[PDB]
């Protein structure tokens, strides 16, 4: 029933998938052996959305894991709940990409794409009623940034009516781990803008900031970051798996969130988050939820919304709540901050309600906001790219396998055009 299949690639994508599948499995009450041990009816009517049924009464996730090196999947198989994934789904190369976007998009990914395309076609054809595809990947690593975009292009050429999501990890210039981030990041964005139906950006700097300031915990880790991001994924599609006061599908969110076809890059947020010491003080109410949800520092993107104007916003609530307070609070927050909302799109907030809360909570909020404040990410990325590119540094690695500087220049020009157009609507007035 309007189900979705999962695609994950790269070491980062595999690590995100390992936690997201754990979260969804625990929310649906499924053991790592694949046997149900839940307690409520609601955990099973819509179980076909994420799980396929095999003989013997067990469930298997409908995910496909890819990489150019075998270590990452041979490692995730050792993690908890690693038994769920089907060995036929794993696809790996024997070489790896080495953070070369050209290598992972032209030479090795080109020959590897056949098997993963075959399996994704089989998986899509098997399910009765498609809803869409979701991808999780990092733009800083060569294998992800190349292979994922190439697969996006290939599968978009085959399924033009299906909806597509990308959860993209954009490399920040503060917490920088490799020296070739600008090149593959720009080349990834150039291909992403043409094909991705929705793109949703996550920054490790923002994750560290929120973990350090809101959680106030001593030692963060990639596990904690994956925990936050997995909660973010579960929030958007909860109401697709459970009933509620107002159902809202991915297509509904897409219709109500993107005014123009080329403006589909979102910043998201999850509420509530509280420290261990402060969890016993705060009272979970709708005002607290919305005030934390519109907080600038709660955002999982380093971009600051108050530097720009919201094109539109969407909020998904989880738990048993009455619509009066939701609507009144959203009206009040729209009225009290009239400066930060562009005026020619009146009533630019969408709300949706699901009555099944996350296990252990009563009320939760997942927020997706299309704002013009994201332009600074692309501005700094393009600045670093042009500074490192004017001297033709780190270039022959990309040019040694069929790539030329014309593609680089075209990508830079396209990205700058996107930035200029995206800021054009910021100053538009009626």
């Amino acid at each position: 029933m309007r189900e979705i299949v999962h695609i994950q690639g790269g070491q980062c994508g595999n690590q995100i998938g390992a936690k997201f599948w754990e979260v969804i499995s625990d929310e649906h009450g499924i053991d790592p052996t694949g046997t149900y041990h839940g307690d409520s009816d609601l955990q099973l009517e819509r179980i076909n959305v994420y799980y396929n049924e095999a003989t013997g009464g067990r469930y298997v996730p409908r995910a496909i894991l890819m990489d150019l090196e075998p270590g990452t999947m041979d490692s995730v198989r050792a993690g908890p709940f690693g038994q769920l994934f089907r060995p036929d789904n794993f696809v790996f190369g024997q070489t790896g990409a080495g953070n070369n976007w050209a290598k992972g998009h032209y030479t090795e990914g080109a020959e590897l794409i056949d098997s993963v395309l075959d399996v994704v076609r089989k998986e899509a054809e098997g399910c009765d009623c498609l809803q869409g595809f979701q991808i999780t990947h990092s733009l800083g690593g060569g294998t992800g940034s190349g292979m994922g975009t190439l697969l996006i292009s290939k599968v978009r050429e085959e399924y033009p009516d299906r909806i597509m999501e990308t959860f993209s990890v954009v490399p920040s210039p503060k917490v920088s781990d490799t020296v070739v981030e600008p090149y593959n990041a720009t080349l990834s964005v150039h291909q992403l803008v043409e094909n991705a139906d929705e793109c949703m950006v996550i920054d490790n700097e923002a994750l560290y900031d929120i973990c350090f300031r809101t959680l106030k915990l001593t030692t963060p880790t990639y596990g904690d970051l994956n925990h936050l991001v997995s909660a973010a994924m579960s929030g958007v599609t909860c109401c697709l798996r459970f009933p509620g006061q107002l159902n809202s599908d991915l297509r509904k969110l897409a219709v109500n969130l993107i005014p123009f076809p080329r403006l589909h890059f979102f910043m998201i947020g999850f509420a509530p988050l509280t420290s261990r010491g402060s969890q016993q003080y705060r009272a979970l109410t709708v005002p607290e939820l919305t005030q934390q949800m519109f907080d600038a520092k709660n955002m999982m993107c380093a971009a600051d919304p108050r530097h720009g104007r919201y094109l539109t916003a969407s909020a998904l609530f989880r738990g048993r709540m009455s619509t009066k307070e939701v609507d009144e609070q959203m009206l009040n927050v729209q009225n009290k901050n009239s400066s930060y909302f562009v005026e020619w799109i009146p009533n630019n907030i969408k709300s949706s309600i699901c009555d099944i809360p996350p296990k252990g909570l009563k009320m939760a909020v997942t927020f997706v906001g299309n704002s013009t404040a994201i332009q600074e990410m692309f501005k700094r990325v393009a600045e670093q790219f042009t500074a490192m590119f004017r001297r033709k540094a780190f270039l022959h690695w990309y040019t040694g396998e069929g790539m030329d500087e014309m593609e680089f220049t075209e990508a830079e020009s396209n990205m700058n055009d996107l930035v200029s157009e995206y800021q054009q609507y910021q100053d538009a007035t009626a």
Partner: protein, 436 residues
């Protein structure tokens, strides 16, 4: 399923290979016999360096070459005699005697064929071969000649396979021989267009480090070999131990060498403290990463403060945490005495591995839960080339010692092209170092 092949030529190469293979064996828990540690009791990591013989013992994927038999005789008589395969310790009959021409044109060509046969016999076994490591004292005739010959032969036999050269250039003022400028320049002319990555291993800096830190006022070659082996292990741990952020051998030529002509780096290791005060300081990640960038801690006798930085690759092994690493990176960037080149906004590559550094019995270093190994490409390395150039021209002004090479099959002009290649390298470095 990933392997690397080790090549050790020259007396220094042999004397450092022995030290590094003691360390690898201790790391993987093998006894000198080559088996499991007796009958007191298999994670499958040894495949990176060792290969299972089919029944019990392990044979390393390394080859030793020499023209003078001596060191081969002692290694075949010592305690590791049963460990190595009897027919991979290639020994010649007459040494080149500090003559580059002898080892490049006269007597090494009869041994290079057997060496290539053995290299093929080791390579065909491997299936996911990452590449080759080569060790050679550059200031020696046979070492330089065979190192060259093997480099150009491998470059055409294999092609795209990666090779890493850990060469030991002569010190600015301390040297054992009197003719090493000639063969060092010729060897550099050879390796410039054939080696993917080259690393400085000058001996003066290591002597100074041992004197200042280990408090050893009478150190010998063994300590230097132990330090170099520690560098090797810190570099190659990532392939055989689990880590939060892994770096392969292929993830060096894509991050550390901005242009193909520029592939010479210099290294540093931290912490380097004698055990008598080693843990009377907390050895935190911040202080170890500051000591790593300290100019007095360079593995080569070069001062980075005289030039800019293009690339820095650091591998942390032990109890490091990414937040602490990033916090240290921020402080290093904010520090004013270290400046990066303009066209490189971010220049740090970072790798994390969980296996702690080891201590070797009879060693000098203390076994610590945290360590960092740094390899940097910076403009300051032109000074050593300049001083070697001056030393070479001082010799060549009166054509001294030239007969010893002319009479060995190589003609008069080869010095000219080597000098021109050095000049071109200096041109390239000082052209890159200028801001836009």
């Amino acid at each position: 399923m990933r392997e690397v092949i080790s090549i050790h030529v020259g007396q220094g190469g042999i004397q450092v290979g022995n030290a590094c293979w003691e360390l690898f064996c201790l790391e993987h828990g093998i006894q000198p016999d080559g088996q499991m540690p007796s009958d007191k009791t298999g994670d499958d990591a040894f495949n990176t360096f060792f290969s299972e013989t089919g029944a019990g013992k392990h044979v390393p994927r390394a080859v030793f070459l020499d023209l003078e038999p001596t060191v081969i005789d002692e290694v075949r008589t010592g305690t590791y005699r049963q460990l190595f395969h009897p027919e991979q310790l290639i020994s010649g009959k007459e040494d080149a005697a500090n003559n580059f021409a002898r080892g490049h044109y006269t007597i090494g060509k009869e041994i290079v064929d057997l060496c290539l046969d053995r290299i093929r016999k080791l390579a065909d076994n491997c299936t996911g071969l990452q590449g080759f490591l080569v060790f050679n004292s550059v200031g020696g005739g046979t070492g330089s000649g065979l190192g060259s010959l093997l480099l150009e032969r491998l470059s055409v036999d294999y092609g795209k396979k990666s090779k890493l050269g850990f060469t030991i250039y002569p010190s600015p003022q301390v040297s054992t021989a009197v003719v090493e400028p000639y063969n060092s320049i010729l060897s550099t002319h050879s390796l410039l267009e054939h080696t993917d990555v080259a690393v400085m291993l000058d001996n003066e800096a290591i002597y100074d480090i041992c004197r200042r830190n280990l408090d050893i006022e009478r150190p010998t070659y063994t300590n230097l070999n132990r330090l170099i082996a520690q560098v090797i292990s810190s570099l190659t741990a990532s392939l055989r131990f689990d880590g939060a952020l892994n770096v392969d051998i292929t993830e060096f030529q894509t991050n550390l060498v901005p242009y193909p002509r520029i592939h010479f780096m210099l290294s540093s290791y931290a912490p380097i403290i004698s055990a008598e005060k080693a843990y009377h300081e907390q050895l935190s990640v911040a202080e170890i990463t500051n000591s790593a960038f300290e100019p007095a801690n360079m593995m080569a006798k070069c001062d980075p403060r005289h030039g800019k930085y293009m690339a820095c690759s650091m591998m942390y092994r032990g109890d490091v945490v990414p937040k602490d690493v990033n916090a240290s990176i921020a402080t290093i960037k904010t520090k004013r005495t270290i400046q990066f080149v303009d066209w490189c906004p971010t220049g740090f590559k970072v790798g994390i591995n969980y296996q702690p550094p080891t201590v070797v019995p009879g060693g000098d270093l203390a076994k610590v839960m945290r360590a960092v190994c740094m390899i940097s490409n910076s403009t300051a390395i032109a000074e050593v080339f300049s001083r070697l150039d001056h030393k070479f021209d001082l010799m060549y002004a009166k054509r001294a010692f030239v007969h010893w090479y002319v009479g060995e099959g190589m003609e008069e002009g080869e010095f000219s092209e080597a000098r021109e290649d050095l000049a071109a390298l200096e041109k390239d470095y000082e052209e890159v170092g200028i801001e836009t």
